[PDB]
Amino acid sequence: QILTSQKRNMYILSRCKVLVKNGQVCHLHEDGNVYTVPYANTVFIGLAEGTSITNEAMSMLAANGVIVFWTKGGGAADIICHLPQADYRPTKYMQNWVRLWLDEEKKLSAAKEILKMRVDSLSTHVHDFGVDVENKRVSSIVNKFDKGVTQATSFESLLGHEGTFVKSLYKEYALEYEIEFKRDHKSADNYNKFLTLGNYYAYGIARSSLWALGIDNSFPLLHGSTRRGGLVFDVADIIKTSIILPLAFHAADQGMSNTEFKRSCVAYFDKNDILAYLINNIKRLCMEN
C-alpha cells in the first residue's frame, strides 16, 4: 500500500545473516545484535561478503516488491539480481518497449534521449559543494556531448561521445579536489571505492524503476562492445555523473566512513525523489510514440 517510488530505505549488507525473526525481516550479526529492515518501505537489499539469506526472508521481501542482488557476481556488470516473480507487472509499458526496441531507428532515437537525460539530471540534481556544474568548462563538456549525441548515425558513435562525456567529468572533479584520478575497481583509494559502492545504489534504484514498469533488463538501448549489463545501466548512468560522482568525491575527500557515505546517497535519493524521477523518465521514453 506504499507506492514503489515512495519507499525510502535501501541497504548494502555485509558479514551477517538475513532472516525472519518475530515476523520481521532482519539481519543478525556475530555479536548477537539483530537489526530490522522495514520490508514495506525498502527499495532494495544488496548482499556483500559474508552474507546469507533464507527463503523465508526472500519470500517476504519479494511479496513487498523489494529487489535483492549480490555485489559479487562470480566474474561490475555480472551482478546477480533476484526480482519478484509472483506479483505480475503492468503490461502496457513492456509492450511499447518491444515495439520501440525492434525498430532500429526508434531505438536509436530512444538511445539519444536516454543519453540526454544525463544532461538534464546534471543540471537538476545539484550539490552545495565541489564542482560548479554551471561553470564554463562543464558547460563546454556538456555542449560537446549534446551535439555529438544529436548527430550520431550509429550506436557505436553514441558510445564514443558517452565515453568522452564521463571521462571528462572525472577529470574535472579530479581537478577540483587536487587529485590525479584514474578509474579502477581494484584500486583501494576511497575515490574509486566510494564510486563503486555508490554505483550499487544507482544500480539498485534503476532495477527497481524498471521492475515497477515491468520492463525487462534484456532490452538495453545502448549496446555494443563494451557496453554489457542490460538496460539497467542505461538508466543508472543518468544519475551516475550527477549524483554518485559528486557524492563519492566529496565523501572520499573528507575521509568519510562507508556508513556515512551510504547514508548520504539514501538521503539524497529521498530528498530529490530520484526513484520517481527515473520511473517518470523511462515511462515517457516508452509512451510518446
DSSP state of 39: G
Stretch binding a second copy (CB under 8 A), from 27-35, 42-50, 121-129, 278-286: 42-50
C-alpha grid cell for residue 40? Answer: 514495506
How many residues bind a second copy (CB under 8 A)? The answer is 64
Which residue, 37 or 244, has its beta carbon nearer to K ion? 37
Residue 53 interacts with a second copy (CB under 8 A): yes or no: yes
Is residue 57 within 8 A of residue 13, CB to CB? The reply is: no
Using DSSP's 3-state secondary structure scheme, residue 10 falls into: strand
For a second copy, the binding residue among 94, 174, 179, 266 (CB under 8 A) is 94
* CB atoms near residue 150 (< 10 Å): 11
Residue 18 dihedral angles phi and psi, to the nearest 5°? -100, 125
- Find the shortest distance in angstroms from Cβ 61 to K ion: 9
Place of cell 541497504: 11
Tell me, residue by residue from 123 to 152, as one string, x for binding to a second copy by CB under 8 A and - for no binding.
------------------------------
Tell me, residue by residue from 8 to 27, as one string, x for binding to a second copy by CB under 8 A and - for no binding.
---------x-x--------
DSSP H or E stretch at residue 165:
helix 155-176
CA distance 107 to 98: 10
Residues at the contact surface with a second copy, assessed by CB under 8 A: 17, 19, 47-55, 58-64, 68-92, 94-95, 98-99, 102, 207, 211, 214, 216-220, 225-232
